[PDB]
């Protein structure tokens, strides 16, 4: 766990997260809002890329 | 072969090819885990006959 944010009124949660030097960083996003079934996506930033799911 | 049997005899062997039309029809399986599924025996049937040829 390096971050835990909430979706605002643009529906954006912005994570400022580190870049490893050349190592690909698989990050699992577990997203939930109670009253809707929990959903998951795992996207990988291969270096600095803005991974929007 | 144009055997041009006119006023002028021209005999030209003009080689030509042919192949019927052919079509690719596609099945797909997926899971919402974010991984496509596999391991399928997938049978396409010529059900243009009126029957599953």
Round to whole Å and give the CA distance between B38 and B29.
Answer: 7
Residue B12 exposure: Cα atoms within 13 Å on the Cβ side: 7
DSSP one-letter code for A34: T
User: A30 at the B interface (CB within 8 A)?
Assistant: no
Task: Residue A40: list chain B partners with CB under 8 A.
Answer: 33-34
- 3-state helix, strand, coil split of chain B in percent (to 5) is 0, 15, 85
The separation between CA B26 and the C-alpha centre of its own chain, rounded to angstroms, equals 14
* Interchain CB contacts (distance < 8 Å): A and B: 4
Which residue bears the tokens 């072969």?
A: B1
Round to whole Å and give the CA distance between B31 and A29.
Answer: 17
Residue A39 exposure: Cα atoms within 13 Å on the Cβ side: 8
Task: Residue B34: list chain A partners with CB under 8 A.
Answer: 40-42
Round to whole Å and give the CA distance between A24 and A19.
Answer: 9
């Amino acid at each position: 766990l390096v971050a835990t944010q909430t979706t605002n009124s643009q529906g954006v949660a912005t994570f400022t997260v580190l870049s490893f030097p050349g190592v690909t960083q698989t990050f699992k996003l577990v997203a939930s809002l109670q009253g809707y079934a929990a959903s998951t996506a795992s996207v990988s930033i291969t270096g600095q890329q803005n991974a929007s799911v | 072969s144009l055997s041009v049997q006119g006023t002028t005899s021209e005999s030209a062997s003009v080689n030509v090819q042919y192949v019927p039309l052919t079509s690719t029809i596609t099945a797909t399986v997926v899971n919402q885990e974010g991984s496509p599924l596999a391991g399928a025996t997938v049978q396409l049937y010529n059900t243009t006959s009126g029957s599953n040829t």
